Amino acid sequence: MQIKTVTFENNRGERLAARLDLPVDTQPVAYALFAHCFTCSKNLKAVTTISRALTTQGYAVLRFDFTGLGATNFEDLRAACRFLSAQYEPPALLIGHSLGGAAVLAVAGEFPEVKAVATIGAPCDPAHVRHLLRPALDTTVGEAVVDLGGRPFRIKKQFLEELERVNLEDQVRTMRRPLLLFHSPTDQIVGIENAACLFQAARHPKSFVSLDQADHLLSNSDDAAFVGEVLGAWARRYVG
């Protein structure tokens, strides 16, 4: 594995940063976009453990920090996908954790080259997102403060507005791509009922893997390794 810092712009010319994790394979089996909220934790051990499991299997992984902790919206995720399409290969796998999971599910259908989608702890609807969010104080307008049980962060109000308008369950039903949902039954932030909701909305192929006693932010790195290894093995059926 080699890790690189990358930079790219969105359609407003704003500069975004990400980390690109490359495998030993000169040609990766696939490039994955991984939109996540693990930056809410005390460290990045969860996301680097997942990413390392994927690079071990030959994937390249673009880690996109959805929290902005180092304000996000759908266009920033699209910008990351365009960056991969231009400078690498269009991503064949989308991965989303927490709010990032809701985001990748809502945009996956926009990208024909995406062959598989996987999420971790994703909420299924606006009511369960509202549980996590409150309006931020205006000065910079139109943002919200998110609480996932760790470091809080800001996002654009446009995110929930757009998510509510496109309807996540409709998007999942019409995605026409294989889906893998990970969720902990003991998740205190986004309840396990959200995974059942998403699974019922989806069409086959659809899959679900239980994270047993894991927490929302995967603070046990054994759980993060598990997610990465299973995800990589599963997606290989579809990406090549």
Nearest C-alpha neighbor of 64 from the set 80, 53, 50: 80
Asked if residue 77 lies in contact with residue 104, where contact means CB atoms within 8 angstroms, the answer is yes
Domain range annotation of the chain:
1-240
3-state class (DSSP) for residue 182: strand
How many Å from the N-terminal Cα to the C-terminal Cα in the chain?
Answer: 20
Nearest C-alpha neighbor of 181 from the set 104, 88, 118, 110: 118
Tell me the technique behind this structure.
Answer: X-ray
Considering only the top CATH level, what class is 1-240?
alpha beta
Query: What residue ranges in 136-178 does DSSP mark as E strands?
Result: 143-146, 153-156
3-state class (DSSP) for residue 194: helix
Six-digit token pair at 147?
A: 């609480």
DSSP letter (8 states) at residue 125: S
Strand order from edge to edge, sheet including 116-120:
2-9, 15-22, 59-65, 30-36, 93-97, 116-120, 179-183, 206-210
- What one-character-per-residue DSSP string does 56-105 give? HTTEEEEEEETTS---B-HHHHHHHHHHHHHHS---SEEEEETHHHHHHH
Question: Does residue 205 have a cis bond before it (omega within 30 degrees)?
Answer: yes
Provide the Cα torsion 135, 128, 71, 18; round to 10°: 160
Spatial separation of the C-alpha atoms in residues 129 and 79, rounded to whole Å: 23
